[PDB]
Design a protein around this ligand. Structure first.
Ligand SMILES: [Zn+2]
Lengths: 56, 255, 259, 120
RNA sequence: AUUGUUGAUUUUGUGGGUGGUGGUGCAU
């Protein structure tokens, strides 16, 4: 199990600015907030199971 | 007959060959389709279309959320008739009586016999106390008549269902309870015999309920005490023996 | 209109699903739930033509991945229709072993099952055989007490029919800790068949399943009803009681304690 | 009618209509998608990161969402409906909720207007 | 908790009811 995994996705600066550390899936059904799992050779979506290249 | 049989065997193998071919063609189709997976998904995504519940459907979703606010009724089982209960009780009495007769005549439950054992014999909040001393500390400050209350509370506080491991904790407490029953008898009690008689038999009644579920833990403690009495007898003879041993031998007959 | 290349791609899938019995499913098939227009993609695969084996595998895939509102459409348009047609077209009017498992997996999401499978069935001329088969699935599989209690209250409110009473009898056999609101609703249902001004239900002939359901309620929720609720039911058994079941229902009701 | 008592009914009405996002992950997902209408955050969260992130998301200039503070996470969970009801009627086996986000008010109630008026 | 990301649908401990898409004949 991974604890407080959602926190790792976001970094917040001292000024309160929130920056996303992971990319979102472009699938319309997935919509915003569905985050691609970062693998060494690919970006994977856990919802629609789509695969995207890391530098695409 | 033989020609019919070679026909049947041949017919079976011929279909068995067809199914395997049909299975093979299907796997080939899937593999080819998977290779074209990326190409098909591309345009299909490009054509993805752009961006009310039935009033019956609303009510069901509404309904479920009120029911959680409500309290839940306890379900009950069908009541057996007095005749059925008596017949069931009579049936159990018959079985237990028959088993006792069988064991009386040499039936040994592991159903072996006594003669089998004779091979090679002659040739060669509330804390649950795991130890007896722990129980006394908990009941150190109480009157004698209050021992059944804490002993019963320890059982209630540690039933098997409340948490995992409570069977073992009560299993050890069954042994600890027995060492308490014999321990109290050793202690002097002529001053308050009536009070002692109220606690000692109450504890024995509790110990009987434990034995029904934890006889194996009780049996091990019983056999250890028999070793302890023997060992003390070897060095002190009668001086080792006490009133606790006389009480102990009696409880074993009960349980 | 899907892309023309896609139509051949899923038409090829439709041929595969017709004879599919084991192995891995098409990868184009496993991604249908993620598509928004699955209602159109699913159509070209010919759901009516699927093997029974694919129906179970589609139910695993679609129910677990689609949303609650959408899974209701899948269960209603596909799983329910295949359930009804299969019973009617079979010689012995049974249900195929794989279609049987799909209903169990569809019950994984109780909200979609009840509103997509059960309620439409009983409100669309369910026969006794369908109620028995669907009742068995509901009896065997674990369902949450909350959803069933809303569902149990729902069926009791519908017009009386033997097919509906089968589901009422099943949901009472489950021995759920029915909330007091649902227990009252059960009381009203049995109360409304007593002759008083009242509807035809007072005089409607009552099959045995009605009395088994009323005995089931008495056996389990006798201790859960008020004294007032007890006397109305005791009146009901007096007037509409069965020859053999009635006395047993009376025995159970008197043995219970008021809440 | 206190502010705390107002939120008791408001959240309960949202529950009846499946309009609540319960928990951090659902709350964060709801906020980023722009479906959040109100945020109730626990002040007593042990991890400062949780408070920092939700406050940042609720204060996004694109989608400013009002935020409320609650003393106890266990006490918020009872509003979110996680706990079960005992025979006596008191809540039992309640589960703490660090964050709760309302997606749909379901029904318009005077207590909802009172909550909005404070924020305006 | 758990599903395959999802959200209380499951999992764990302790009890525990069930023969039932069962057949085969009989009586409108
Ligand atoms: Zn995706």
């Amino acid at each position: 199990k991974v604890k407080l995994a959602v926190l790792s996705y976001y970094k917040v600066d001292a000024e309160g600015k929130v920056t996303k550390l992971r990319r979102e899936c472009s699938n319309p059904t997935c919509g915003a907030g569905v985050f691609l799992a970062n693998h060494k050779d690919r970006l994977y979506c856990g919802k629609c199971h789509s695969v995207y290249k890391v530098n695409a | 007959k033989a020609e019919v049989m070679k026909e049947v065997i041949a017919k079976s193998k011929f279909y068995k060959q067809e199914r395997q071919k049909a299975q093979g063609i299907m796997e080939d189709q899937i593999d080819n389709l998977d290779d074209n997976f990326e190409d098909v998904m591309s345009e299909l995504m490009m054509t993805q279309p752009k961006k009310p519940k039935t009033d019956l459907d609303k009510e069901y979703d509404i309904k479920v959320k009120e029911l959680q606010l409500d309290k839940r009724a306890a379900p009950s089982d069908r009541t057996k008739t007095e005749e059925e209960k008596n017949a069931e009780a009579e049936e159990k009495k018959r079985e237990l009586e028959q088993q006792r007769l069988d064991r009386m005549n040499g039936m040994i439950e592991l159903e072996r016999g006594v003669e089998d054992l004779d091979d090679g014999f002659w040739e060669n909040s509330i804390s649950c106390p795991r130890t007896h001393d722990a129980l006394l500390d908990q009941v150190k400050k109480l009157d004698l008549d209050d021992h059944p209350k804490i002993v019963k509370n320890i059982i209630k506080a540690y039933q098997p269902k409340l948490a995992e491991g409570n069977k073992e904790k009560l299993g050890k407490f069954t042994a600890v309870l027995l060492r308490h029953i014999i321990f109290l008898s050793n202690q002097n009690y002529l001053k308050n015999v009536q009070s002692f008689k109220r606690t000692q038999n109450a504890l024995i009644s509790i110990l009987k309920s434990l034995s029904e579920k934890y006889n194996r833990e009780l049996s091990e403690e019983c056999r250890d005490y028999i070793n302890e009495m023997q060992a003390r007898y070897k060095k002190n003879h009668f001086d080792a023996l006490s009133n606790g041993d006389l009480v102990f031998f009696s409880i074993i007959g009960i349980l | 209109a899907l892309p023309e290349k896609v139509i051949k791609a899923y038409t090829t899938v439709g041929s595969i699903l017709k004879t599919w019995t084991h192995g891995k499913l098409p990868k184009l098939f496993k991604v249908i739930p993620s598509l928004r227009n699955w209602q159109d993609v699913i159509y070209v695969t010919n759901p009516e033509e699927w093997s029974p084996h694919v129906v179970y595998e589609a139910t695993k895939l679609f129910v677990s991945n689609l949303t609650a509102k959408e899974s209701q459409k899948f269960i209603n348009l596909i799983l329910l229709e295949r359930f009804r047609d299969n019973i009617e077209t079979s010689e012995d009017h049974s249900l195929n072993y794989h279609i049987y498992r799909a209903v169990k997996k569809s019950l994984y999401k109780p909200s979609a099952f009840f509103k997509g499978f059960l309620f439409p069935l009983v409100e669309t001329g369910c026969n006794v055989r369908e109620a028995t088969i669907a009742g068995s699935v509901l009896a065997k599989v674990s369902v949450p007490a909350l959803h069933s209690s809303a569902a149990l209250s729902y069926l009791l409110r519908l017009p009386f029919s033997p097919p509906t009473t089968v589901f009422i009898k099943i949901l009472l056999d489950k021995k759920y800790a029915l909330p007091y609101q649902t227990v009252d609703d059960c009381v009203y249902y049995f109360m409304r068949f007593r002759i008083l001004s009242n509807g035809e239900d007072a005089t409607r002939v009552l099959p045995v399943i009605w009395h088994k359901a009323f005995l089931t309620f008495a056996q389990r929720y006798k201790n859960d009803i008020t004294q007032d609720q007890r006397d109305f039911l005791l009146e009901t058994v007096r007037q509409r009681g069965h020859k053999d079941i009635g006395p047993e229902i009376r025995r159970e009701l008197l043995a219970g304690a008021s809440r | 009618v206190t502010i705390e008592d107002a939120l008791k009914v408001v959240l309960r009405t949202a529950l009846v209509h499946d309009g609540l996002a319960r928990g951090l992950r659902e709350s964060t997902k709801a906020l980023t998608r722009g479906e959040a209408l109100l945020v109730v955050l626990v002040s007593s969260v042990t991890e400062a990161n949780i408070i920092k992130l939700v406050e940042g998301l609720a204060n996004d200039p694109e989608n400013k969402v009002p935020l409320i503070k609650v003393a106890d996470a266990k006490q918020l969970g009872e509003w979110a409906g996680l706990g079960k009801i005992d025979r006596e009627g008191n809540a039992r086996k309640v589960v703490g909720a660090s964050v709760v986000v309302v997606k749909n008010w379901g029904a318009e109630t005077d207590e909802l207007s009172m909550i909005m008026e404070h924020f305006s």
